[PDB]
């Protein structure tokens, strides 16, 4: 993918919404984050028709 | 370790690790009593109705 293309010498920098975790940071360095977020669940509106 | 904040000067003079909690500036104010919206008798309906 994108990280595989980066490690293969195709590009030098990555500007994309890439998260930060242990496995990916073990190989490359991550700078300070510019935006904080998390994980949630998205569902559809119920809209009861009672 | 503790509740030390990471800014430009401290990060330039001292190396910091990855953040583990969100922090920021936020103003704290006391509770202000609200007011009811006028014309509340037209609430359970619409003007088109």
Tell me the series of helices and strands of chain B, N- to C-terminal: H
The Cα radius of gyration of chain A reads 18 Å
What composes the largest sheet of chain A?
none
How many strands of chain A?
Answer: 0
Largest interface: A-B, 5 and 5 residues
Number of helices of chain A: 2
Beta-strand residue fraction of chain B: under 5%
State the distance separating the first and last CA atoms of chain A.
48 Å
Oligomeric status of the shown chains? part of a larger assembly
Largest sheet of chain B: none
Which range best describes the helical content of chain A: under 10%, 10-25%, 25-40%, 40-55%, 55-70% or over 70%?
A: 10-25%
> What proportion of the residues of chain B is helical, as a percent range?
10-25%
What does this structure look like?
- Chain A has helices at 2-7, 22-25.
- Helix content of chain A is 20%, strand content 0%.
- Chain A contains two helices and no strands.
- Chain A is mainly α.
- Chain B has one helix and no strands.
- Chain B is low in regular secondary structure and 49 residues long.
- Chain A binds chain B through residues 20, 30, 32-33, 36, and chain B through 6, 11, 18-19, 22.
- Chain A: Glycine binds at residues 17, 19, 24.
- Chain A: Belongs to the glutamate-gated ion channel (TC 1.A.10.1) family. NR1/GRIN1 subfamily.
- Chain A: This is Glutamate receptor ionotropic, NMDA 1.
